[PDB]
Design a protein around this ligand. Structure first.
Ligand code: UP6
Ligand code: UP6
Lengths: 217, 217
């Protein structure tokens, strides 16, 4: 089947120093079992931070690296990322099918997962990404992709995305909170929501996460 | 003005282990003063590898990170990358103007450079990238971007790119060699060519670089 995310809540840990990242994550460890780590933290502290999170919290790690290179390089990025212990990696679909397949090849070989990013939540996404979103999602479906990332800031787009990928596919959605996305509205189509700043920048992260979950009881 | 690249040749160092990368680069150090480092090497050996290259070879480093996130995350990636010593960073234009501007802001503050990736050389680029290429290039020009990356595999596209960005803009082009691009034809529009596998995978890297430069004099 597809992965099970505790409380349908994924923590986006984009703090850039190990101490704060581990500290804040520890404060909310009781509310989640899946953490999304991106380049802000990895480039600042090193790829070893991925294995550290998995061992210290027993959590699943999704590497939000928005892989967007040529096939050969994508394969290398994925291999290095999975070797570092990542359970899944987020890949852009805009570069084309060959670039996505290169990632799928490595994930299948190593027994990991690929999440296809279909559309982004920021304003700039309307320039080029929005118009290719439906076709990117269909491309994923045609290649057997089972995991997707869609924008929480555009509910009707997320809904359309779900229609394209089917009820079987696993869908997670960022842009909740700081970017304006609503937890409840987003979960009408997504299997899990991604939350970053609203939690890690709060004066009380535990309360922030607790409140979010309370909002979606 | 714009940066000066020795012999109009930029080495794409995508080997993934420090010893091999430093060894091969050392073998061809007499032919170049600018090296492009990407995620394959950085994720495998750490961001400190950037400062190591600058100190060991006295070269300029272009971080080929194909930055493609939301504005706030792009800003963080750029800051971390420039803090690590990178002279320039390659950014995707498909995520939109705000995502590009976030990178430009950090580069201006830290006195570094942003290279806008307009179109890619691999087959998959035809799906979505090629159709947005001219507009991405125009977006860069409208925002004052002075450095661009265009495909060597499609000379007519590269030529069109040069027309859009003007003669004053700095243009470098990957896809030369392994991907089928020709050195001479590419330099008809580009200020410098990027070469990876054709050099670092050759039996004699120095001979390979020496040959490329010879056939381009
Ligand atoms: O389409 C996407 C894919 N990923 N992210 C990422 O998800 C997190 C959202 O964080 P936020 O809750 O602080 O906005 C950040 O890591 C950001 O790079 C998006 O915002 N949109
Ligand atoms: O549009 C782009 C941008 N960057 N690269 C990168 O430039 C190098 C080209 O290497 P090659 O000579 O081995 O094909 C690799 O690092 C690759 O990720 C491309 O191929 N195309």
């Amino acid at each position: 089947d597809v992965m099970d995310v505790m409380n349908r809540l994924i923590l986006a840990m984009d703090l850039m120093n190990r101490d704060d990242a581990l500290r804040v994550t520890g404060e909310v460890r009781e509310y989640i079992d899946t953490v999304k780590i991106g380049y802000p933290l990895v480039l600042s502290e090193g790829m070893d931070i991925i294995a550290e999170f998995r061992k210290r919290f027993g959590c699943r790690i999704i590497a939000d690296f928005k892989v967007a290179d040529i096939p050969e390089t994508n394969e290398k990025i994925c291999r290095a990322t999975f070797k570092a212990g990542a359970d899944a990696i987020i890949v852009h679909g805009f570069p084309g099918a060959d670039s996505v397949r290169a990632c799928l090849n490595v994930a299948e070989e190593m027994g990991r997962e690929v999440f296809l990013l279909t559309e982004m939540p920021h304003p700039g996404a309307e320039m080029f990404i929005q118009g290719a979103a439906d076709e990117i999602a269909r491309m994923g479906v045609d290649l057997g992709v089972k995991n997707y990332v869609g924008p929480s800031t555009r509910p009707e787009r997320l809904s359309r995305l779900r229609e394209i990928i089917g009820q079987d596919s696993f869908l997670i959605s960022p842009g909740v909170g700081a970017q304006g996305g609503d937890p409840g509205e987003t979960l009408r189509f997504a299997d899990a929501i991604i939350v970053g700043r609203s939690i890690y920048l709060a004066d009380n992260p535990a309360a922030a996460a607790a409140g979010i979950i309370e909002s979606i009881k």
